[PDB]
Amino acid sequence: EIYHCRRQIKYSKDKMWYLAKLIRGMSIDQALAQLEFSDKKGAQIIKEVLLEAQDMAVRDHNVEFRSNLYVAESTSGRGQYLKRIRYHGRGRFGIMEKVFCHYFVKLVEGXXXXXXXXXXXXXXXXXXXXXXXX
Amino acid sequence: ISHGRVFRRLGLGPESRIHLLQNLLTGLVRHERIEASWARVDELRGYAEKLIDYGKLGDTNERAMRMADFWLTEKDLIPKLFQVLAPRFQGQNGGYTRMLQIPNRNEQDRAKMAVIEYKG
Amino acid sequence: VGLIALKLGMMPLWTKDGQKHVVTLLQVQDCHVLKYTPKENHNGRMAALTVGGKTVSHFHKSASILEFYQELGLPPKQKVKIFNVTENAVIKPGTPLYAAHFRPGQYVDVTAKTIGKGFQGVMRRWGFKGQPATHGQTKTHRRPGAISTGDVARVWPGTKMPGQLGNIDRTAFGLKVWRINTKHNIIYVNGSVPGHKNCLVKIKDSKL
Amino acid sequence: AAPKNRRSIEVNRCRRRNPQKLIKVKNNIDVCPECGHLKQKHILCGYCXXXXXXXXXXXXXXXXXXXX
Amino acid sequence: XXXXXXXXXXXXXXXXXXXXXXXXXXXXXXXXHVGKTDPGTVFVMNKNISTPYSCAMHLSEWYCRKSILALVDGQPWDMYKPLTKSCEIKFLTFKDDDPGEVNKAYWRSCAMMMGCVIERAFKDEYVVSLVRAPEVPVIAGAFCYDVVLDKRLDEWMPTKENLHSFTKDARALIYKDLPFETLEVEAKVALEIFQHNKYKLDFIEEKASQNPERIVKLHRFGDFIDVSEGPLIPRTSICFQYEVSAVHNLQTQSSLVRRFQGLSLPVHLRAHFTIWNKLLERSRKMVTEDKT
RNA sequence: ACAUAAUCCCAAAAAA
Ligand SMILES: [Zn+2]
């Protein structure tokens, strides 16, 4: 498995998670194209992370075929918070919290296989007949 | 309501809109091609065709003359418009002011970019 | 007895009596009977009335739509609608039809799509008076004001409030037909018709 | 107005995930007919065009500087 | 007929395993692939019987899935065509200005495919008997599949529902996603496998013996085997749809020949259902023509 | 004869 991580980078975790779930389960190529033409602040960063992950995959692991690489797991954690003073009216100060995001990428070789297909009639006729016999 | 209405706003006043059109048309006739937002471009098309047609009317004619002087203040644009750009489009009717799309977006507002160009 | 039409426009007419009459024109492009569905409990049978533009065939793609047009031997059509026929004696198989089907002096009902106003305030919808524009009134001018009473917490279902208006089906009743043109396929109908010109409308037999 | 009580995790997740549908993924990817590079659909390439537009801008600046 | 087909498939699998073993017996080789499709690309690997499609996979998944044909040293080849030593690899696709090669390959793949389908349907009923004739490609956009049948099939008429069922089974095998195999075999073992088919025997004996190359390429799809002098369609996912248009009966030298013909869909794209019906009419008319 | 939706806790029933 090929792991890559980026910490102490300042971006919205909730916003980066949008592009993080986007490439999860998807193949390297499709994820690359997506992140390239995806419009957001996380697009560039996650693109860099992916590119570095591919470079590490090729150089360190010495992978024979690049097409056998896909994205198995992607996650976004929260780092330290920078507290800033936001000046408001009537002599009151609010607390502006600048967040941070630690991006983690876990890659596994082999062809990507994901099936979300579920037959309704089969699952119903099986679960009902098994629940009636229990 | 927006029902049956051309002549968009784009967050500018009437004078600001007209002046914007005059500036974009200035750059367009000067450089023969320009890059701007898709809305401003699509809006600029018709006015460009209008100025071209006004140039096609006549050089000696006063109506076309004062119209051309009204929209374009610059003294450099008019002779290049009438003597050079106009006679090549003489045969064309709707064949000028082509619009194309630009692959990337701005780093700030991510505004959709488009280019307007006359036929060479 | 009825057919699907297309709103054309309006214009005044002058009767020999000298009385002015404001009428609207309903144009008939094409009409064909597609499917005939018999029923029992409803005590009536349904027929298919269809007005095509023939252009939409390529830009509108569906399996069932195209297969329907092809298997029925029907040319490409823009609008397919249904009509309820109570009388079983007047029911005919699939046939093309003309705008001569209507006669002058007959009162008809017109079903069409009302003009969409988009998102509209409490005004222009339920026709509320609103608040005054003066005398210390602050930002209450177009506001609906109070809604419910302290007794009942929740507001009653069906309460009048600002929202989307128009773009829905409406039927106008009691519209007299002054005259019809077969060759030009034009229908002269006295009254008002829902929606803008070129929008699909429906001419049906009224109830009097 | 002010919130009556603190939001539970479940409501937050169900609100921030399902209805927004995250980011809907369509296919914008198409191969450039010229250089064969991957670019956006219904749009000019970002490889064989931007360089030619910069060369055309430099040629227009050189022609405008030579004419003056 | 099932035992003979299973014995022929087992003998063909054993002959393919023996030929592959004797040819790949030396696993030490140098394969260098260098060339510009897109700008320049330079790669060096060590393998025997190297596949250029594996190099397409080496580049990326995109160029891999978009790979149709492989141009090597100026000579067009299939993506399954083995490469040796130094080679210049180019990727040819349908959208390119040279549709000819992928078109011919497409028509020959379609002929083969139904070559399997008809046989499988004829394996459903033991009553029928099938003998394969040679296939005739037509650059006009047509392909003619020639065969002969038992007397019982000569007496019984080909009702419309039949051909519809053949089409359904064809699409069935089309979404079944079965990979094509490319084998290199001698004319002898091939003669032995094709013994039950007279026309193919005559084909190999007459044509292949005059050829200096004793190495013949057998394309295997499922339990079906076909002889091809040219490239084959990359996968079963490449072909979106298929149709059976019509048949013909030719009389030559007091012999009857039954020729089936149909059409194919390139790059998994169809304009509409209307133009599809139009394509049916066009297909049948092109069958009526029988170009030669 | 009082003011949001009914029955004096469901539905009904009958007159040890
Ligand atoms: Zn390009």
Task: Give the residue from D31, D37, D45, D48 with the most E CB atoms within 10 Å of its CB, the best one to mutate.
Answer: D31
CA distance A27 to C77: 43
Are B81 and B25 in contact by the 8 Å Cβ rule? The answer is: no
Q: How far is CA A121 from the centre of its chain?
A: 33
CA-nearest of A100, A107, A103 to A5 is A103
Q: Subunits with at least 3 CB pairs below 8 A relative to chain E?
A: A, C, D
Report the nucleotide nearest the CA of residue C151, measured to C1': F4
Query: What is the experimental resolution, given in Å to one decimal place?
Result: 4.9
Task: Give the residue from E61, E64, E175, E177 with the most A CB atoms within 10 Å of its CB, the best one to mutate.
Answer: E61
CA-nearest of C88, C63, C79, C73 to C30 is C79
What residues of B are designated binding site for Mg(2+)? 3, 42
Q: What is the number of other CB atoms lying within 10 angstroms of the CB of residue C14?
A: 9
Report the nucleotide nearest the CA of residue C154, measured to C1': F4
Q: What Å value separates CA C117 and C1' F14? A: 64
**Inter-chain Cβ pairs, chain D and chain E, closer than 8 A:** 9
Q: What is the number of other CB atoms lying within 10 angstroms of the CB of residue E132?
A: 22
Is E269 in CB contact (< 8 Å) with chain D?
Answer: no
CA distance A66 to A57: 9
CA distance B51 to B21: 11
CA distance E212 to C64: 57
CA distance C114 to C117: 9
CA distance C70 to E281: 14
As given in the structure block, the two tokens for residue E65 are 């899935």
- Cross-strand partners of C83: C47
CA-nearest of C31, C35, C119 to C75 is C31
Are C67 and E277 in contact by the 8 Å Cβ rule? The answer is: no
Establish whether the CB of C151 is closer than 7 Å to any nucleic acid atom in strand F.
yes
For chain D, the residues before each gap (C–N > 2.5 Å) are none
Taking the CA of residue C62 and the nearest CA in chain E, the distance in Å comes to 8
As given in the structure block, the two tokens for residue B49 are 């065709």
Sign of the CA dihedral with C71 first, then C76, C78, and C84 last: negative
Secondary element (H or E) of residue B68:
helix B62-71
Q: Burial, E260: exposed, middle or buried (Cβ in 10 Å; 0-12, 13-18, 19+)?
A: buried
Domains of chain B: 10-120 (3.90.1030.10)
Phi, psi of C193 (to 5 degrees): -120, 140
Which residue type sits at C165?
L
D32 is in an annotated binding site: yes
Q: How many helices (H) and strands (E) does chain A have?
A: 4, 5
Among D16, D22, D25, beta carbon nearest to A34? D25
Q: What is the number of other CB atoms lying within 10 angstroms of the CB of residue C102?
A: 23
State in Å: Cα D31 to ligand 1 middle: 8
D 21-50 residues inside an 8 A Cβ radius of B:
39-40, 42-46, 49-50
Q: What angle do CA C136, C138, C144 make, to 5 degrees?
A: 120
Going from the C-alpha of E33 to that of each of C91, E41, E73, E96, E274, the distances in angstroms are 76, 8, 11, 22, 46
Are B55 and B82 in contact by the 8 Å Cβ rule? The answer is: yes
Q: Which residues of D touch A18 (CB under 8 A)?
A: 22-23
Q: What Å value separates CA C144 and C1' F14? A: 57
Q: In sequence order, which residues have a C-beta less than 8 Å from that of residue E18 and are 6 or more positions away?
A: none
Q: What Å value separates CA C153 and C1' F8? A: 26
> For the stretch E209-233, what's the b/e string if a residue is b when 16 or more beta carbons lie within 10 angstroms of its beta carbon?
eeeeeeebbbbbbbebbbbbeebbb
Q: In sequence order, which residues have a C-beta less than 8 Å from that of residue C28 and are 6 or more positions away?
A: C3, C5, C6, C51, C98, C99, C185, C186, C187
CA distance E247 to E147: 10
Using CA coordinates, name the residue in chain D closest to E96: D33
Going from the C-alpha of E155 to that of each of E147, E148, E151, E244, the distances in angstroms are 16, 13, 6, 21
Are B15 and B61 in contact by the 8 Å Cβ rule? The answer is: no
Q: What Å value separates CA C147 and C1' F4? A: 15
Q: What is the DSSP string of C113-177?
A: EPPP-EEE-STTTS------SSTT--S-SS-----S-SSSSSPPTT----EEE--SEEEEEEEEE
CA distance C81 to A19: 45
Establish whether the CB of C146 is closer than 7 Å to any nucleic acid atom in strand F.
no
Q: What is the number of other CB atoms lying within 10 angstroms of the CB of residue B13?
A: 10
Which residue type sits at E33?
H
**Beta strand D29-31 pairing with D38-40:** antiparallel
**CB-contacted nucleotides of strand F (7 Å):** 4
CA-nearest of A127, A7, A17, A23 to A71 is A23
Q: How far is CA E170 from the centre of its chain?
A: 14
CA distance A65 to A69: 8
CA distance E66 to C18: 77
Enumerate chain C positions whose Cβ falls within 8 A of a Cβ in E.
57-58, 61, 63, 66-67, 70, 76
Q: What is the number of other CB atoms lying within 10 angstroms of the CB of residue C145?
A: 10
Q: In sequence order, which residues have a C-beta less than 8 Å from that of residue A121 and are 6 or more positions away?
A: none
Q: What Å value separates CA E282 and C1' F16? A: 94
As given in the structure block, the two tokens for residue E176 are 């079944």
**Inter-chain Cβ pairs, chain A and chain E, closer than 8 A:** 22
Are C163 and C124 in contact by the 8 Å Cβ rule? The answer is: no
Q: Cβ A22–D25 below 8 Å, yes or no?
A: yes
Q: What is the number of other CB atoms lying within 10 angstroms of the CB of residue A8?
A: 9
Sheet architecture: strand order including B112-117: B33-37, B112-117, B98-105
3-state secondary structure E125-181: CCCCCEEECCCEEECCCEEEEEEEECHHHHHCCCCHHHHHHHHHHHHHHHHCCCCCE
**What is chain D's length?**
68
Q: In sequence order, which residues have a C-beta less than 8 Å from that of residue C61 and are 6 or more positions away?
A: E272, E273
Are C8 and C25 in contact by the 8 Å Cβ rule? The answer is: yes
Sign of the CA dihedral with C128 first, then C132, C133, and C138 last: negative
CA distance E121 to E288: 25
State in Å: Cα E38 to ligand 1 middle: 10
| Ordered alpha helix ranges (H), chain A | 13-20, 28-37, 41-59, 120-131
Establish whether the CB of C152 is closer than 7 Å to any nucleic acid atom in strand F.
yes
Using CA coordinates, name the residue in chain A closest to E57: A67
Report the nucleotide nearest the CA of residue C153, measured to C1': F4
- Cross-strand partners of C177: C189
The three-class DSSP label of residue A83 is strand
Q: What is the DSSP string of C10-77?
A: EEEEE-TT--EEEEEEEE----EEEEEE--STTSSEEEEEEE--SSTTTTS--HHHHHHHHHTTPPP-
Taking the CA of residue C80 and the nearest CA in chain E, the distance in Å comes to 18
Establish whether the CB of C71 is closer than 7 Å to any nucleic acid atom in strand F.
no
Is E251 in CB contact (< 8 Å) with chain C?
Answer: no
Are C27 and C5 in contact by the 8 Å Cβ rule? The answer is: yes
Q: Cβ A65–E58 below 8 Å, yes or no?
A: yes
Among D42, D50, D60, beta carbon nearest to B101? D42
Q: At what angle do helices B14-31 and B38-57 cross, to 10 degrees?
A: 70
CA-nearest of E145, E114, E154 to E241 is E114
CA distance E237 to C42: 50
Per the entry, the structure determination technique was cryo-EM
Which residue type sits at A9?
I
D14 is in an annotated binding site: no
CA distance B27 to B20: 11
> For the stretch E138-149, what's the b/e string if a residue is b when 16 or more beta carbons lie within 10 angstroms of its beta carbon?
beeebbbbbbbb
Report the nucleotide nearest the CA of residue C156, measured to C1': F4
State in Å: Cα D48 to ligand 1 middle: 4
Going from the C-alpha of C208 to that of each of A46, B42, C103, C109, E8, the distances in angstroms are 71, 54, 16, 11, 83
Q: Which residues of E touch D33 (CB under 8 A)?
A: 95
Query: Cα torsion at C14, C15, C17, C19 (round to 10°)?
Result: -50
CA distance C43 to C46: 10
Q: Cβ B103–D46 below 8 Å, yes or no?
A: yes
Which residue type sits at D3?
P
DSSP label of D46: S
Are A84 and A98 in contact by the 8 Å Cβ rule? The answer is: yes
State in Å: Cα E52 to ligand 1 middle: 25
Are E85 and E45 in contact by the 8 Å Cβ rule? The answer is: no
State in Å: Cα E261 to ligand 1 middle: 41
Establish whether the CB of C90 is closer than 7 Å to any nucleic acid atom in strand F.
no
Q: What angle do CA B92, B98, B100 make, to 5 degrees?
A: 160
Q: Which residues of C touch E272 (CB under 8 A)?
A: 58, 61, 66
- Cross-strand partners of E262: E244
Which residue type sits at D21?
K
CA distance C198 to E122: 58
Q: How far is CA B87 from the centre of its chain?
A: 18
Q: What is the number of other CB atoms lying within 10 angstroms of the CB of residue C198?
A: 10
CA distance E12 to E118: 20
Going from the C-alpha of E27 to that of each of E21, E46, E51, the distances in angstroms are 10, 9, 14
Q: How far is CA C47 from the centre of its chain?
A: 18
Establish whether the CB of C150 is closer than 7 Å to any nucleic acid atom in strand F.
no
Q: Cβ C61–E277 below 8 Å, yes or no?
A: no
Q: What angle do CA B35, B56, B117 make, to 5 degrees?
A: 15
